[PDB]
Amino acid sequence: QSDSKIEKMLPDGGRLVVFPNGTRKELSADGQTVKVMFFNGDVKHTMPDQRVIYYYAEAQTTHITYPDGMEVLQFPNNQTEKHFPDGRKEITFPDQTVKTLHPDGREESVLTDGTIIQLNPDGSKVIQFNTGQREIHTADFKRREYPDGTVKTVYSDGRQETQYPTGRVRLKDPQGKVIMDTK
């Protein structure tokens, strides 16, 4: 592409190159370091330790690319995103929740208290608590699994099933009345 380009020579032996589209590039004397100052205000610095650091002037965002392929974006609202080469993304929101988006469509958030929420691509959720309790939410019911082995399920029509650690199963109508009991 570009032909109408201008180079100048730094006293240290580095080069400054100015391009007709406005882009400026600074190369060290060994050529090993490159600073690119784009016409739009963006800035790209390649590093000694090999990080590539890009600054988006309008969006006010920095974007680091690391040697293993990881990209890490730091947004003005103090939010950070890590993008991995298999397509996984890990978002750290301002309030320090971490959410991962996996390739398959799962999302997995970890809360400030260590509670884990997993959002499958079918719409169902799994919550896992510190206490050992799990909840499972599908479109038909919400199920709580307790550490003692008790499982309570509330269906979308308001019927509630308890399953006791022994295997006994009690089902109640919306009103609270037992309508089935496996003894």
Partner: peptide
């Protein structure tokens, strides 16, 4: 390349 990268978007 010489051209700026496209502006990026945070996740909602």
């Amino acid at each position: 390349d010489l051209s700026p990268r496209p502006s990026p978007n945070p996740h909602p």
